[PDB]
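Task: sequence in, structure out. Protein: Lysozyme C.
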Amino acid sequence: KVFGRCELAAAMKRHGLDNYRGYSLGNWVCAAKFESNFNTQATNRNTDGSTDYGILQINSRWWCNDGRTPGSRNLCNIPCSALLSSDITASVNCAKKIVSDGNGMNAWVAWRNRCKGTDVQAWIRGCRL
Ligand SMILES: [Pt+4]
Ligand SMILES: [Pt+4]
Ligand SMILES: [Pt+4]
Ligand SMILES: [Pt+4]
Ligand SMILES: [Pt+4]
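Result:
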């Protein structure tokens, strides 16, 4: 599913991401925009053989099992395919574990490079929440 900006903001808010570990909603919507362009079905292969999955491009080296990343850790305890669903619940629950891991949202390279220190509130502007 390809989410609209405000539709995704609303779903993320409902799933408890607004101010989760201090990160306002706009940060999460910005990260999703540049990681996956709001497409739950996005996949991207990394040079190390791991793959990133879904709206927040969660990586198979640590977070999920895809059956093809030797020495992967499956920390969210979830097949990576579950992260591609039109229901964002699995992605959100896994992202909560990731952002709690000590590096905050710096775990998402597009967030560091494209969202961090920008006016992220613009991403929720005009939305009914
Ligand atoms: Pt569809
Ligand atoms: Pt709502
Ligand atoms: Pt939902
Ligand atoms: Pt909804
Ligand atoms: Pt594996």
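Residues 10-11, 14 surround platinum (IV) ion (ligand 4) (CB under 6 Å).
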